[PDB]
Ligand binder design. Structure first.
Ligand SMILES: COC(=O)COc1cccc(CN)c1
Ligand SMILES: [Mn+2]
Ligand SMILES: [Mn+2]
Lengths: 137, 137
């Protein structure tokens, strides 16, 4: 059967600024770079940045809610979010509708998130503060 | 410090067919559902389906290369691909890289992939046959 995300591939319009964003600003590990892409890791996540002439820099009001959240500890969350803010990283959401999260944009407008907590922790929180019509299986 | 992918959220135009696709067709575990979304798991992956009227059913020619690959064993790959084909799931690309890959579309046109092989496997193949301009770190 299926088990896990094997990799996340993001189409990027300009490879160098995107590599810099994920490696330098977000601290991911850069393993390889070539004329049309890069491979990075973030813990167990395999991230591929793929140069794509079709990628557009997309304002957040023009894209749907599809987004990619990265895990961070409770101890590190606030200072990492504040560092992104001070670096001028654009945002896309302010209301914490799914727990402790910071919502920010990559250079192409990919919707990213820092989040503290696992699925199990979110289900437990939702039992007390459920989303409308929520059912647990 | 970021420690991995916390969750992947896909915006969906119709919640019921999307739940059917990820839970019943792809075999992911449904943990909760509410009026505007669902939480599923696939191995370590926390998947959120979020009902979003902004989501367009998007032909693959109209979206960029951003895509989401799920892990499957080599032994299970061909029968899972055949399951998707029996269900009528469209393919958006043929495999031309190392490691088995099946490139298929979700009901809203999200670009998905089944892939066999890790980052380490890809890096080893690339060391032997580097892509154009490839540098390792
Ligand atoms: C001269 O330009 C650079 O050095 C930019 O950084 C790269 C570093 C590694 C690989 C590539 C792609 N060949 C570019
Ligand atoms: Mn999220
Ligand atoms: Mn892929």
């Amino acid at each position: 059967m299926l088990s896990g995300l094997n990799h996340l591939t993001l189409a990027v319009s300009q490879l160098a600024p995107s590599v810099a964003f994920y490696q330098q600003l977000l601290g991911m590990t850069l393993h390889a770079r070539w004329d049309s892409g890069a491979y990075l890791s973030c813990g167990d996540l395999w991230l591929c940045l793929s140069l794509d002439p079709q990628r557009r820099v997309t304002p957040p009001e023009e894209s749907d809610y599809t987004h990619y959240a990265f895990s961070i500890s409770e101890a590190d969350f606030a200072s990492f979010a504040a560092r992104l803010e001070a670096a001028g990283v654009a945002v896309w959401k302010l209301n914490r509708s799914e727990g402790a999260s910071h919502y920010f944009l990559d250079p192409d407008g990919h919707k990213l998130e820092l989040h503290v907590g696992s699925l199990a922790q979110r289900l437990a929180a939702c039992r007390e503060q459920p989303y409308k019509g929520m059912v647990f299986f």
